[PDB]
Symmetry: C3
Subunit: 259 residues, 3 copies
Amino acid sequence: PFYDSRPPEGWPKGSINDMDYPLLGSICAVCCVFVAGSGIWMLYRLDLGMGYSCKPYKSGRAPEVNSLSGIICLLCGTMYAAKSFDFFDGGGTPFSLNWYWYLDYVFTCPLLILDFAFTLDLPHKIRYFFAVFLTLWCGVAAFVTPSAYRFAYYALGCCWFTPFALSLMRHVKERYLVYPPKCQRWLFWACVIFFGFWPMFPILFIFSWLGTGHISQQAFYIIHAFLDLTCKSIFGILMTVFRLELEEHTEVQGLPLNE
Amino acid sequence: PFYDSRPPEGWPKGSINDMDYPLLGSICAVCCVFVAGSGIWMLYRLDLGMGYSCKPYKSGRAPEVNSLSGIICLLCGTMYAAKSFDFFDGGGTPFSLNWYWYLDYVFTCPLLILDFAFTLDLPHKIRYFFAVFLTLWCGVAAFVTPSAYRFAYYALGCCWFTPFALSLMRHVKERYLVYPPKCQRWLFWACVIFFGFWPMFPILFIFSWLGTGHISQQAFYIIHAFLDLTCKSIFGILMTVFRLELEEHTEVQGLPLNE
Amino acid sequence: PFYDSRPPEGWPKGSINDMDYPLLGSICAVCCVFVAGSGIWMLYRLDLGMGYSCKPYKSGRAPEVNSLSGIICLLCGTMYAAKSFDFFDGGGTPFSLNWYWYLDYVFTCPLLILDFAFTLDLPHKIRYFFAVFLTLWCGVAAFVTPSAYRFAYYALGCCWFTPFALSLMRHVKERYLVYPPKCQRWLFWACVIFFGFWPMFPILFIFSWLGTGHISQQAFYIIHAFLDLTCKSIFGILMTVFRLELEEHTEVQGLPLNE
Ligand SMILES: *C/C=C(C)/C=C/C=C(C)/C=C/C1=C(C)CCCC1(C)C
Ligand SMILES: *C/C=C(C)/C=C/C=C(C)/C=C/C1=C(C)CCCC1(C)C
Ligand SMILES: *C/C=C(C)/C=C/C=C(C)/C=C/C1=C(C)CCCC1(C)C
Ligand SMILES: [K+]
Ligand SMILES: [K+]
Ligand SMILES: [K+]
Ligand SMILES: [K+]
Ligand SMILES: [K+]
Ligand SMILES: [K+]
Ligand SMILES: [K+]
Ligand SMILES: [K+]
Ligand SMILES: [K+]
Ligand SMILES: [K+]
Ligand SMILES: [K+]
Ligand SMILES: [K+]
Ligand SMILES: [K+]
Ligand SMILES: [K+]
Ligand SMILES: [K+]
């Protein structure tokens, strides 16, 4: 979708693309390594077996949806490797995963909510998937729109995230009482990460360079690198641990849920 | 995928983009509101229960594929909100869902045929999905190609829609005798909308500005807004009512199908 | 995603796009016809019945995943029809499926590995799908990157294909002993095509115009046309024949597998 490119003399001084590119490339490389390693660990732990006792799967293989967390983390890590390649080249690279904001998210976050719904057996998985998909596409549209109508696109996204976040929460509550306290301990932190950091993105939009202008694009890249390290890597680790505790309770010990 | 933009002095007079943009923006906003409200109603009615008696679901949740109609309608409504944003900005907006014809359809219509197949238990759901996908991509290619080879792409699309429409019809007939007359009443109008309005798009191509030149791009936008009002909103409402009648016959009353 | 176009005077002499376009268009048309016909034959044979005796399906329809091979072949054939349209127009066509290398593959090869996993009941189908997806996107990034960092993207792809190919092979071996010798005969040639021709693409990258410079873009197009003739058409035919033999062994004759 690219039309712009880095000028032969470099990015104009004072522009939003006049950024510390070696630093952002190093940060993206570190994030890539961490998130890819976390996803590899989640996949390996899932293949180890059910629960903390590593009870072998009856079919000999893990459920396919259970590998969503590791796949999302590895995909995010490879996206961050591409981002580091783009940043180390000075930005404006033909295959830039940094240029179009939230364009890389339309692959990870719908999958992330799908994994969250599959782990918690949340209803309307397709509805949540498409809600997150449309919210992220509204964000991409707002970030590529140079006029005031971007705040319309933002608002359109806010017309999707506000109900979805209000719906999911309620549904999550209906599941929260079902699970044992040991699994509830990890579910609490997964929900904290979700309902605390997902709302951060729309708030960070307001104070970005296309909002009040308080956060620059470089600071935006750093903040979103930390957010992806939290929203994908740490959230996936917490989902893996919650799944291990649930399998230990229900499959290893044979105990029923509080439903 | 964008390269062109609205010239600083505006669209050249007499060009295909010299269009009544406030009117098209208002039409797109009205279509967005109507289709999004219809999709919200479909999802709410699906969550109400099975059939006209609103019999509660045994699992407590509706089937995931049953929410396809409302999801398609909400996605189309948000696409039309984006279209109204693009039109009210004067067109040629970086995130324009109006520029590339049938590009927005590659998300709605494959899902639409998937929903139709799931509701009627039609065979080869993946085959129909990919047939519609390839037909719409051939249409996008024909609309972005400025040479005569666009009529090749159009022909390629006609090499996909003609068999598919001839196949689906036959398969639909095999299902039409299965359902009771009350459900057949809604199935008749759903099939009327399908086999009447889906062929309209290739016919409208012939008389468009890249065909015979009788229908301008503004008139094309209005006609396709009405078509999406019929093909997505009304067709989804008819699918919801047919599903309600089928659930009343088979689940509420326990009566069997005529198979 | 297009920004470049064929210059009004034509492609500059000596450039990578100064190619024999009538010849490439004819080759692409022949490949389109062959692959589309092969996919049509696979779908028709699948609809005929299970095994060589054409035992009717109990549900009256073939499994949906069983039609993946024919769908992939038909999609590749239509992509090659579009490629022939682009080449016959002189290249640089707005909807060019030839410009961005491996961009058309991100639709066929993830589906190809999905079909291979479904036919052989290979574990971690989603993992293999996403591994191939990310490998192909790394290839697209390497082919659109003009700097040395393309060899980074290539390396990133080599960081995905090398484990996946090493994993799938092992998993394939676990399935190879399960199947009878008659099905093993077709599985051997399917695995030969896979593990011989899939590694060819990264090797062909090294000697292409963005590598050592020994293979031109025209020769690359011809070689990849033959590869798609082998990797999609012949591999799909071998999958269809292996499925027929497996259904004859297990469904027609009722014999069990060697598991
Ligand atoms: C790892 C990345 C994650 C979890 C990204 C999440 C993204 C969102 C919650 C998106 C938020 C937006 C909307 C609420 C509308 C306005 C635009 C966005 C993209 C900031
Ligand atoms: C709500 C939108 C709908 C139902 C769109 C349907 C689209 C088609 C039936 C597409 C038709 C085309 C072909 C038959 C080939 C030539 C190009 C098209 C896109 C006009
Ligand atoms: C019909 C097309 C097929 C089977 C294509 C297969 C593609 C690959 C095995 C891709 C290979 C690549 C990597 C190993 C990384 C470097 C870039 C590629 C695209 C050459
Ligand atoms: K799961
Ligand atoms: K996992
Ligand atoms: K990007
Ligand atoms: K970005
Ligand atoms: K940017
Ligand atoms: K349905
Ligand atoms: K619905
Ligand atoms: K568009
Ligand atoms: K349009
Ligand atoms: K246009
Ligand atoms: K299969
Ligand atoms: K097949
Ligand atoms: K292409
Ligand atoms: K190509
Ligand atoms: K090229």
